[PDB]
Each structure stands twice: as structure tokens, then as C-alpha cells.
Amino acid sequence: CDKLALEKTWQLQKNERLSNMVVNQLNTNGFCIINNFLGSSCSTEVLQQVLNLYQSGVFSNGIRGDKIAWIGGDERGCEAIKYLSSCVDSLISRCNGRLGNYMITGRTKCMVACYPGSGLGYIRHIDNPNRDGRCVTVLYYLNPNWNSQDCGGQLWLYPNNENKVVKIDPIFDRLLLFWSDRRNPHEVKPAYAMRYAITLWYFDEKERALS
Ligand SMILES: [Mn+2]
């Protein structure tokens, strides 16, 4: 994994396809899935670093059954997490100006999360119900060979809070983006194996000022 500075022309063109897809799918449907976002070698390095963090005891309790650690990217042993964040930042930067009226110039740290099996999940909720500044939620999933029929842990998304449910498996190297506000209630269904993911929330500068 070459942890983005000197990408090839073919990679730039792929990256433009990705951002155009994100813009069109967020604006049209309120969410967007990208399969195989980083590739297996780089995704494996992200997962290895997440497990090392988890084994070191730095996670803390996150209604919700997750354990979390906030990673800015400059921590020892987190260079692959930093690389992930740089890739998502570049993706969002290519979309800014095209995502609603939002002015996206910043984000949270990476929220590394584990639902440690045991039937744990997160009930239906809205990430940003109260104008807290967060406009786009980004999930990066890290679970190899995950069969949700056995492992549970699907994300159930309710676009536009209507009757339709979208059931999303938390599969390795999958990126998911969705509007953080009341347009996208969602729930993490109970997990029966250790379930790992990283979340980044991107801010709308004008709303984030409020808090
Ligand atoms: Mn959520």
C-alpha cells in the first residue's frame, strides 16, 4: 500500500468517476455505496492497524453497543487510517460545491468503532437531528468474509424516512456516504461477530459555526 500524491492519469480519471457518482447518488437518493474503495492490500493494512489499536485497550464505550476510539491520523501505527482519511478528503473535495448548498471545509477525526459481537448494535437514530454541523456521514467497513445471515450487523437505512428500507452489509473495503440529517434515519442491527468500521463526518461550515 503506497500510503495519492503522484497518482497516474488513469487513477485521476477513476477518481473523477467516483466523485461524479457520489454527487449524483447523494443528490438523487441521499446515499451512495462505493465497493472496493481502497483495494485489498491497503484495506488489510487499515484493518490491521484498527485491530492493533483495539488490542492496545484504547477503545472506550461509545442505546448503542459500540466501543470507539478517535484517530486524527498522526498517531503512532495509524498511517493507513491516515491514508484512508486522505482518500475520503480528496473524494469530498472533488464534490464540494455540488453537494446541496453545503460548504464542506472540515470534518471530525476518524471514529474507529467496534460492535464486539454479543448481539450488540445501535437502535434507529439520526446522526444530526439538531443542526450540529455534520452534513455527510462516511462509513468505511472493515469486515472480511462477512456473511450477515450468520454475523448480523447490517446497516438498515430508511431514505427520506419513508417505508423503504435499504439493507447494507458491512463488507470489507466498502465506503458508504449519506446525508447526516433527518433524511437518513438508520440502525445497526445486532452483531454476532466483532464488527469494525471507521466513520468520518464532514461539516457544513455555516451550520458548524453554531456549536
Ligand atoms: Mn449513525
Cβ atoms of 33 and 22 closer than 8 Å: no
Distance CA 200, CA 203 (A): 10
Q: Which residues pair with 191 in a beta bridge?
A: 120, 152
From the list 170, 173, 91, 83, the residue with the least C-alpha distance to 136 is: 91
Distance 82 CA to ligand 1 centre (A): 22
Bridging pattern class, strands 175-179 and 31-34: antiparallel
From the list 179, 153, 35, 175, the residue with the least C-alpha distance to 100 is: 179
Q: Is 132 annotated as a binding residue?
A: no
4 is written with which cell numbers?
Answer: 495519492
Q: Which residues pair with 37 in a beta bridge?
A: none
Burial of 63 (0-12, 13-18, 19+ CB in 10 A): exposed
* Technique used to solve these coordinates: X-ray
Q: Is 125 annotated as a binding residue?
A: yes
Distance 187 CA to ligand 1 centre (A): 7
Angle, CA of 51, 146 and 135, to the nearest 5°: 75
Residue type, 194: M
The answer to whether the Cα torsion of 60, 167, 148, 17 is positive or negative is: negative
Distance 74 CA to ligand 1 centre (A): 25
Distance 194 CA to ligand 1 centre (A): 18
List the domains of the chain with CATH numbers.
1-211 (2.60.120.620)
Distance CA 150, CA 190 (A): 11
209 is written with which cell numbers?
Answer: 459555526
**CB-based contacts of 53, cutoff 8 Å, min separation 6:** 59, 69, 71, 77, 78, 112
Q: Is 74 annotated as a binding residue?
A: no
Place of cell 462516511: 138
